[model samples]
Target: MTMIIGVYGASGFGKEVMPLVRQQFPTLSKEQFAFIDDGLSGTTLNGYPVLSYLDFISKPADHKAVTIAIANSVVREKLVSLLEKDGVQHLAVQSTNTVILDEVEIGEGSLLCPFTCLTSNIKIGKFFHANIYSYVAHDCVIGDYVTFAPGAKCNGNIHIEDHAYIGTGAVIKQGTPDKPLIIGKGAIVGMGAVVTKSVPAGVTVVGNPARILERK
Candidate 1:
């Protein structure tokens, strides 16, 4: 029983990051990798074994490392708690080409996808999902379980609260350091929107300057 690496969630996000998992651990053989999913146990996804959470915990691995591959912010947090309860260490992974500059602090369980960039003086929290081409500019504070869809642009001096989802190709305007633009907790920025003002909590904002479209 040697160490094993499992990517939790065997569906879209799980399959999407499988290549990068291999890239992250080039020494790992196919047999040492698994997809941890309660729904798809005993099956094969992307040629890797799919193990239920229960089976994965009971598997005979001297050491186990897993990265939560789920996209939903709320669900991601739940899985993190469950993994910690099982005494399994989580691994944060990034693409070889992803860029990180000065004084950036990233919390555990992050999945930084290909071509993502984080610039200076950024603080990001646990289980962050930065999808492909998403970039966070300087002086940003991002909370736990924040998901940046592909090509989302976060400008400087912004505070994004926990469980917020930045939609694909959306752009957030820079705020003053004294008054950072805020994306409130559980807020959703719709696709292609340009956010100039602070968003309210638990609402979906769309269009230029991001008017409140719906309250969720």
Candidate 2:
């Protein structure tokens, strides 16, 4: 069976991730990957075919592997649902520079970009995006569709719930084993913020010692 591998979303994030995907799966030919974007039709990018979502699915292939490259967590999840119904398998991608220590288990459709690090005993859920220079220390539980922006630092024994966005250069302090720090669902940590306490669900946090920025 011919296996089709593609990256959905041919925008900025897609461009950034494609290189990592190429690096991660060196054995796979460049020809095997189709750049899947609903917006771009009849376009070609750097020797790769830019296929529309419909056109991509129409290809005569028994199996399909796709990485959702959109940065928005909720949008990524929606795409996952759409792709899942089409029976396209999710592809977990990590850069060659990604360093991991002992016992780290990450779920499917994850994207760990360049210079990302995961220390011992870390569990990451599906479609998680850890951007360049991001690091998660030991015993961190990161939920599905969680996005760690560039240089975000996650300390040990932390539980980041689903759909959380840790912005660029944010530092989340370490928690105890018995009382792990929790970043609640759909919370957004502002860029360069230093988190000390647990953030509630669907809230925006910002500042040196992170304060609530009210909900939308």
Candidate 3:
């Protein structure tokens, strides 16, 4: 029985995640995996076939797992729900260069990129994406579809809710055990912002002190 592993999305992020997939499953041959992009059917991407979603689903393999490589949290969430409805197994891919310490829990469909560090006792929800050089410190709880852009730093005892986007070089200050720093659902912490206080849901925050810039 040939096991087929599919990677959703054929963009640059998909290309970047392919190597991590290879690293995570070293024994899996390149022929056993493909890029599953509905738009790029019959085309080649990064030396691999770009298969349409329907095309891949038409032929059931003995075993299959898919990783959603889209960067947009909302888009990824939608795709995840669709794939889940089709009973597609999701993959949790972590780069060989990434460090995950003891008691760290990463849910299905999560991607931890190169040089990322996950300290002890961290809980991450489904379809999470932690980009290069990002670090989540101890006792943090990160929710579903949360994105950590390159070099984002999460301090201890923080709670990042679902669909939150932590931008590049953003630093979250350490919170007390009784009062964790919370980044609410659908919030956007802009690049280089230092988050010292709890951010409300559905708002965009920027600058060093991470004040609200817009609300959605």
Candidate 4:
């Protein structure tokens, strides 16, 4: 029996992830995979049918696994929530090159990109994405819709709230014995910055020894 997998979201991330899904999981033929994008009206992406959001998964298919590939945490979170509420079981895709230690709790629709590493005892929420060469140290609590761009590093006992975006090559130091760092919700840490202290919610920070710059 052919395994049918659906790719939700039509963003750049979605397009990139679909090919990876096909290459890594060949059990599902090219014809078996389809795209569902609310914005796009067309029925094809690089030759595969890009079904409308309303009619993509209307009928029963052999395999029920769906991939939520949107990079934005909030959107991905909603998608996962709806699928779960409807009782659809989806697969979490991680690159073969990604390293995940045992005892790590990764929520559904999470993707660990190539060369990413997660230390032990980490709680990662749904629809999370850790870009290449990123590392979350032991005992970190990452909330849903969090994104770590390439070369991102975080020390232990940190709490990152939902919808946070960490830019490329950012480094977050481990909290002190008494105080752990907290990144508030909807925060954005700029590229190549060093987070020396805690960040409040809905803020954007940049530069070495990161400091708050703006808010949206």
Candidate 5:
């Protein structure tokens, strides 16, 4: 049976992820993969048909799978819930160049980008997006809808809660086994920040020492 793969977003992040999807499923023809958008303004995107979410869901197809390419954590979560309600399946895609070491668990719908690395004993939750050059070290626990922008780095024994956003080039300090460096839920670690301590929930931290910038 032929499989139909839909990329759930037709914009920037979606376009970036499309090539990786093609790499993951090398045998599938271009026609088998499509761009799915709720607000599609065009009929074609990067040589693939751009279909509305409703149209794609209602159309008769076999072995359907969707990879969400939206970048926003909240929006991605909502989209996932919506897809689940409609009995749609999600696919976890990883780049060929990514290095995943022993005992790493990646949840469904997660996207591991090119040159990303996951070390031992890491547990990443659903709908996680690890951008290019991101790395997570040993014994780290990541929650659902976590986003790692390009070049983000997480050291050992860190706990990143759900909906946290680690910006580009951010570095998280290593934590002891007894006291993991925790990034609380809905927190934002700004670009190039060096996280030396735990972050509170729903806060935005920036600068070298990663101080609180605002409550988000």
Candidate 6:
């Protein structure tokens, strides 16, 4: 029996993840993966058929796992929730080239890109995505739909709320004996920024030692 893999979200992330999946599990053929795009007819992407989400879910196939490939954090979280309720088991797909330590808690639908690393005792929520070269230290509490861009780094015991985006090359300080870093919900720490203090919700911060940038 051929092991089947379903990819949810047929946008750019899905297109990238499909090829990586084939590379990781070489025994699986191109036909083994079906893209669950809610839009568009079945088409070829990296030599695999891209089917609408409804079409794939309706049809019968030997489904082994599902991968939610949406880049947008909120959308990814919502979709993951729906799929789980529908009784579909999802795969936490990391590029075989990535480093995920043992004892790291990677929730369902999490996407770990190539070169990313999560040390022991890291608790990640569902539908998380850490892009290339990102690292999270021990005992970190990362909430749902969080995205860590390439080169992002966070120290231990930090509280990252839901829907937060850590941009490329951003660095977050570890929790101290008195104060721990708390990133509020729907926050964006811009590229190359260094976070020293806590960030309020629904804001974008940038620069060395990050500061809030008000949207007008």
Model 2 TM-score (2 dp): 0.96
Task: Give lDDT: candidate 5, residue 103.
Answer: 97
lDDT of 6: 0.81
Q: Output candidate 1 Cα RMSD.
A: 1.0
Candidate 3 runs further than 4 Å off: none
TM-score of each: 0.97, 0.96, 0.95, 0.88, 0.96, 0.88
Q: Among all windows of ten consecutive residues in candidate 4, which has the lowest summed lDDT?
A: 54-63
Looking at model 5, the pairs that clash are none
What are the clashing pairs of model 6? Answer: 37-53
Give the runs in model 5 whose Cα sits over 4 Å from its true position.
none
Q: Compared with the true structure, what per-residue lDDT tens digits does model 1 show for residues 36-140?
A: 999889998878899999999998989999988888888888888898898998898999999999999999889999999999999999889999999999999
Would you list the C-alpha lDDT of every candidate in the order shown?
0.92, 0.91, 0.90, 0.81, 0.92, 0.81
Error of 6 at 179 (Å): 2.0
Per-residue alpha-carbon lDDT of candidate 4 for residues 147-176, written as tens digits (9 for 90 to 100): 988899988989899999988999997885
lDDT (Cα, tens digit) per residue for candidate 3, span 83-147: 88888899989887789899998888889999999999999998889999999999999999999
Segments in model 1 whose C-alpha atoms lie over 4 Å from true places: none
Better of 3 and 5 by lDDT: 5
Per residue, candidate 2 scores C-alpha lDDT tens digits across 77-115 of 999999989989998898887899999999999898999
By descending lDDT, how would the candidates be arranged?
A: 1, 5, 2, 3, 4, 6
- Candidate 1 lDDT at 95 equals 97
Prediction-by-prediction clash tally? 0, 0, 0, 3, 0, 1
Question: What TM-score should be assigned to candidate 6?
Answer: 0.88
Candidate 5 Cα lDDT to native: 0.92
